[PDB]
Design a protein around this ligand. Structure first.
Ligand SMILES: Nc1ncnc2c1ncn2[C@@H]1O[C@H](COP(=O)(O)OP(=O)(O)NP(=O)(O)O)[C@@H](O)[C@H]1O
Ligand SMILES: Nc1ncnc2c1ncn2[C@@H]1O[C@H](COP(=O)(O)OP(=O)(O)NP(=O)(O)O)[C@@H](O)[C@H]1O
Ligand SMILES: CC(C)c1ccc(CC(=O)N2CCN(c3cnc(Cl)cn3)CC2)cc1
Ligand SMILES: CC(C)c1ccc(CC(=O)N2CCN(c3cnc(Cl)cn3)CC2)cc1
Ligand SMILES: [Cl-]
Ligand SMILES: [Cl-]
Ligand SMILES: [Mg+2]
Ligand SMILES: [Mg+2]
Lengths: 352, 352
């Protein structure tokens, strides 16, 4: 039985797979050929079919888990392609979390030699996050922040120690956004959420620009100028709004310049991609700041796949939390951003 | 000198004009003809040029102000057409608020017989709101709420008494959103704001649907189904997410179904208008709820012109605050929604 953990989200399926590297001579001999073919297929390919990807750079090597030494692998594919994954599975104890553990429960049970154990999406997140940080990223910090995020000639990624990680605000940016207040390893609550998340960025961007991938959307946004679409404080006041400490550059109305036909006619797709990214990211940052203030928590860690290969949004979040909180809040990030639920699921395996 | 108050916003100019009705025989004789022509022009027309409108139904009749009896009139036009208004003014003490009091200060001074006194946008809002509610809407309540906002067979507009109006959370939905905590007549702060406001609704809707007016956008939204564009909790979980009290109908990802090309190809403009309205409105409601919780305030009044002739957003706000706060917060609304700044400006006239 291969050791998997699976997080089936609204958009992406994340899979953590533990590859034993201490396979003895007797164990190799007693290996069922199908179990051998799984391990060979998973470790000898980095693309699976047309849409599966192994994130090789995230691999944890020589991890000790459940008393065995092995490597922890991190794999993702679109939830839309889960029927393909299940069909190829019909050609094992599976701990599964995310909404799709419930939605596709019956489909997983079409695999006769499969027991499905559903685990809560956010309990797995907490356990996975705390575990990965505890074992480290192959000796490097799992957690990092952007030092001096207000000055760009100085803004740089630096490691951050989470050895006493409580209390902690966790902002899970997936399709939507869940915000968790973690007070201890067994004491956490979902403070709130927002539906303006990664799927809003991707959905709106596709409507506005015709982009066909998340990566293409980010590439368009990198070339854009969001102030072509956004109305700024200085467009309304002619400068700063000093009475309430609002700088001229702050966005007063997202997409607010698009009420004018002549501006809609001159804006570029790249501008609109960037305005979509900026709008969604700042709104998440502002919501996170308000929850942190209300929960009295000054460490805010952002996870979920909206931030993978998305340094723009990370820097936007780093700068915004630091600026608007006058340095009282810190935006934290984690290398294994999208995978903590899948890892937490895998960690539930002993209970079964 | 006619008694005006003016709020020049990012999108709309609002004007309050006090028409004396106790003009004596000597006063009528000593009236300068240009002053007579202004009063006749303003009271004998309800449309001014191509874009000015007098909201006749909001008129306060037989008001006593500054020791005179008269009628208080409420007039609006697009800020884009302010050059026309100033040019026709060049063919008076003016208290002016809003960002445009600063941005267009020099333009107002091209009118030789004009002294411009700038007043703060939110100080005027507070004073205007408290004044109008104090004098009543011609004997009727200025403030109202939607009773039993969770049940649609019962949801109905009912008056609401603000005689002891403190503390109060004021949510000003204009181009952007300002959120104020009012603790007394002289003690209020801007808690925060958001750039996802009325200009975002109007800008995004115009990009997505080609609508050419605010009213057309609302009309499209009334015919749409936002769930064609939005991904719901039940689309991710297959039902409720009971563990965190999230009903299947709650939006999990706004525009989240638009990541799929086949759904983008089948969605209608009306669906996208409605999803834009729903997305912007719920996000404002959620932000307002978080501020009210943090400020420990249970009365939340929504103003600004995003809600004029917009009963959909009002009902959405009423239902959302009541549902998500488990009945601890009440959404309140005011008949003179967009005009409180203009009235507060007019009330500063004695100071000059
Ligand atoms: N290859 C990709 N395909 C799609 N979306 C991607 C991709 N890479 C990054 N993203 C972004 O990541 C988001 C999904 O993040 P993720 O944390 O995996 O959400 P999820 O678990 O599928 N949804 P949820 O049910 O709300 O928890 C998308 O909305 C995109 O903004
Ligand atoms: N006739 C209209 N034209 C334009 N927008 C309208 C109209 N009627 C209602 N609206 C809405 O009302 C919003 C403007 O409200 P308003 O309170 O007047 O803002 P503002 O004062 O001009 N902007 P701000 O500088 O942020 O205070 C627009 O964003 C629209 O959503
Ligand atoms: C677990 C994943 C799939 C998920 C992410 C995000 C959401 C949206 C969400 O958590 N909520 C709750 C709070 N909401 C409010 C609150 N207060 C108001 Cl006044 C209005 N809305 C908005 C909806 C649901 C599910
Ligand atoms: C007065 C009118 C014209 C106006 C309305 C709205 C705005 C936007 C606004 O008030 N803010 C302040 C808070 N912002 C934050 C806060 N915390 C983070 Cl972490 C990120 N952003 C967003 C910008 C400005 C001006
Ligand atoms: Cl189970
Ligand atoms: Cl002045
Ligand atoms: Mg997820
Ligand atoms: Mg305004």
């Amino acid at each position: 039985s291969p050791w998997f953990g699976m997080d089936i989200g609204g958009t992406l399926v994340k899979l953590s797979y533990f590859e034993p590297i201490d396979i003895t001579a007797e164990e190799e001999q007693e290996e069922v050929e199908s179990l051998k073919s799984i391990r060979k297929y998973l470790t000898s390919n980095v693309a699976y079919g047309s849409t599966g990807i192994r994130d090789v750079h995230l691999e944890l090597k020589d991890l000790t888990l459940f008393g065995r030494r092995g490597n922890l692998h991190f794999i993702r594919f679109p939830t839309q392609d889960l029927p393909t994954f299940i069909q190829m599975g019909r050609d094992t104890v599976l701990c599964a979390t995310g909404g799709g553990a419930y939605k596709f429960e019956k489909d997983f049970r079409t695999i006769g030699n499969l027991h499905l154990h559903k685990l809560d999406e956010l309990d797995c997140l907490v356990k996975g996050l705390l575990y990965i940080d505890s074992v480290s990223f192959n000796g490097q910090a799992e957690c990092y922040y952007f030092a001096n995020a207000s000055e760009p000639e100085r803004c740089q990624k630096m490691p951050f120690n989470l050895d006493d990680p409580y209390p902690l605000l966790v902002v899970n940016i997936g399709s939507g956004v869940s915000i968790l207040a973690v007070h201890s390893k067994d004491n956490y609550k979902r403070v709130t959420g927002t539906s303006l998340g990664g799927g809003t960025f991707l959905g709106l961007c596709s409507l506005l620009t015709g982009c066909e991938s998340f990566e293409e959307a980010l590439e368009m946004a990198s070339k854009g100028d969001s102030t072509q679409a956004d109305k700024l404080v200085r467009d309304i006041y002619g400068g700063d709004y000093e009475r309430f400490g609002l700088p001229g550059w702050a966005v007063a109305s997202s997409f607010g310049n698009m009420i004018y036909k002549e501006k809609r006619e001159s804006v570029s797709k790249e501008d609109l991609a960037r305005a979509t990214l900026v709008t969604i990211t700042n709104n998440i940052g502002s919501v996170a700041r308000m929850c942190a203030v209300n929960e009295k928590i000054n460490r805010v860690v952002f996870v979920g796949n909206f931030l993978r290969v998305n340094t723009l949004s990370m820097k936007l979040l780093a700068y915004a939390l630091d600026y608007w909180s006058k340095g009282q809040l810190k935006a934290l990030f984690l290398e294994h951003e999208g995978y903590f639920g899948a890892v937490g699921a895998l960690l539930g395996l002993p209970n079964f």
